[PDB]
Amino acid sequence: WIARINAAARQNGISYSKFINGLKKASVEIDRKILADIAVFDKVAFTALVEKAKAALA
Amino acid sequence: MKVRASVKKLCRNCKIVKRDGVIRVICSAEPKHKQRQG
């Protein structure tokens, strides 16, 4: 799961190391991985989810 | 002789030299004490 997230999320800025950290900051925003495979079916979602972290990282 | 041992410079007219560590003892005097540990 992380092997692909680390392979998907990083291609569009911020590595898996930084990713979950952005994601980490939230009141409700935390939906775990597993479904994390969004990179395979809802790429738009996923890349729209990388901003949820990239722009999120203080 | 060329001396492979591990001594030092010694003497006066003998140079140290550093091409590989060679304590050396080169002196126009005698090649005897050259001490090139190689």
Binding site: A7, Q11, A39 | -
Partner: protein
């Protein structure tokens, strides 16, 4: 449902052309080894059959960092006992980059079967652009 994207049996293969005429030598192997697996790749669940498709050019332009230009054990012992062991320093072998050096990726892959699938299957050469004995079509 069970999440895991299948193994379309090496679904797609994106062609590429490195340069190797660069200055990174040994450093390059990783982004060369990661690539033929599932680096830039997101989906196509690795572990199972997969890969990509890139290619090296001259590569003859490498120096490594330290005096590695002069080292690198390199021996290709054979099933011959009788005391063999063919040691040749890097520069001594760099005279004809064959199954080695440029092929520094082999030791970096999963090894054995399947990893073996990628292996030299990226092509190497040593002259960059001229008569690309390799597939001329689509590449980046």
């Amino acid at each position: 449902m069970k999440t895991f994207t299948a193994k379309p049996e090496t679904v797609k293969r994106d062609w590429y052309v490195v340069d190797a005429t660069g200055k990174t030598l040994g450093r390059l192997a990783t982004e060369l080894a990661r690539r033929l697996r599932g680096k830039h790749k997101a989906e196509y669940t690795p572990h199972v059959d997969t890969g990509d498709y890139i290619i090296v050019l001259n590569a003859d332009k490498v120096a490594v960092t330290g005096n590695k230009r002069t080292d690198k054990v390199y021996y290709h012992h054979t099933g011959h006992i009788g005391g063999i062991k063919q040691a040749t320093f890097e520069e001594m072998i760099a005279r004809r980059p064959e199954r080695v050096i440029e092929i520094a990726v082999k030791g970096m892959l999963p090894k054995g079967p399947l990893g073996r699938a990628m292996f030299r299957k990226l092509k190497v050469y040593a002259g960059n652009e001229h008569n690309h004995a390799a597939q001329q079509p689509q590449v980046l």
